[PDB]
Design a protein around this ligand. Structure first.
Ligand code: 2HV
Length: 274
């Protein structure tokens, strides 16, 4: 029944705005888990469960996306403590986040970037079908299951319920945020997500993000720092179109010529991660 008896705490995986995440083991079956602690005072968005209880929005969002597709890190359990909330999440073993993977390897081969990008599109697409907008799609929030060659989305703490009306709040990564956000502090769910996907694709094929400052984002001129194919450049520039309405839909991204003949996750691992 308690968490200190049910779980076995290991080293700290990371800490920030999310805020403290530890590696752990579910003592019952020795299942590798992640144990996330967050203070109640350090919580911005709150939501209600179907049974009507005050929980952080992140618990609401994770519950909606946590059955049972391997594209998102599933919420296995959660506890409420007097001054904090404790989240028990899946933890792949062996694992490496996409950020550390690009740092170590540099710009990824187009074949590996295709497999990876398709998997995030399938994951993001799963989230929207569940009525969840991630709002912080970036290299740091993508984990690679090194044995299966499968990508997993983490951190729904900047997220929101997906809607068709304007969003006036944002607390994700600035350098991944669209020009509408920077200029007008207003954006729409799917087109903002497609902009961040273009930022991510550039990062995979070039080994770094295309823009650092507000004026670069606002200008939207894409300079390619590495050799990238005409088709991949076309997809990137389309995702990063200044006018949200000019951006591709998820269907348009997945039907793009560059996006064809994607490797399966297991062959991705056997060719690129072995
Ligand atoms: C290396 C490794 O096994 N990392 C893992 N991170 C998670 C996770 O859910 N992450 C998480 C869940 C909710 C908010 C933020 C995060 N973090 C964890 C620290 C790194 C940044 C994202 C599960 S396993």
């Amino acid at each position: 029944e308690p968490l200190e008896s049910q779980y076995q705490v290991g080293p700290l995986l990371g800490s920030g705005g999310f805020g403290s995440v530890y590696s752990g083991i579910r003592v019952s079956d020795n299942l590798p888990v992640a144990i996330k602690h967050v203070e109640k005072d350090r919580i911005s968005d709150w939501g209600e469960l179907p049974n009507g209880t005050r929980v952080p929005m992140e618990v609401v969002l994770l519950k909606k996306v946590s059955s049972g597709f391997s594209g998102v890190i599933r919420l296995l359990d959660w506890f409420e403590r007097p001054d904090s909330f404790v989240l028990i999440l899946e933890r792949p073993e062996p694992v490496q986040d996409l950020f550390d993977f690009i740092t170590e390897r540099g710009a990824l081969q187009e074949e590996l970037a295709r497999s990876f990008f398709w998997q995030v599109l399938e994951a993001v697409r799963h989230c929207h079908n569940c009525g969840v907008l991630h709002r912080d799609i970036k290299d740091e929030n993508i984990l690679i299951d090194l044995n299966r060659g499968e990508l997993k989305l983490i951190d729904f703490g900047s997220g929101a319920l997906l809607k068709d009306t304007v969003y006036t709040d944002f607390d994700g990564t600035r350098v991944y945020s669209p020009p509408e956000w920077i200029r007008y502090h207003r954006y729409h769910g799917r087109s903002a997500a497609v902009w961040s996907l273009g930022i991510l694709l550039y990062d995979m094929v070039c080994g770094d993000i295309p823009f650092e400052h507000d004026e670069e984002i606002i200008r939207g001129q894409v300079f390619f720092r590495q050799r990238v194919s005409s088709e991949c450049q076309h997809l990137i520039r389309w995702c990063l179109a200044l006018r949200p309405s000019d951006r591709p839909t998820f269907e348009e991204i997945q039907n793009h010529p560059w996006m064809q003949d994607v490797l399966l996750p297991q062959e991705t691992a056997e060719i690129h991660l072995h």
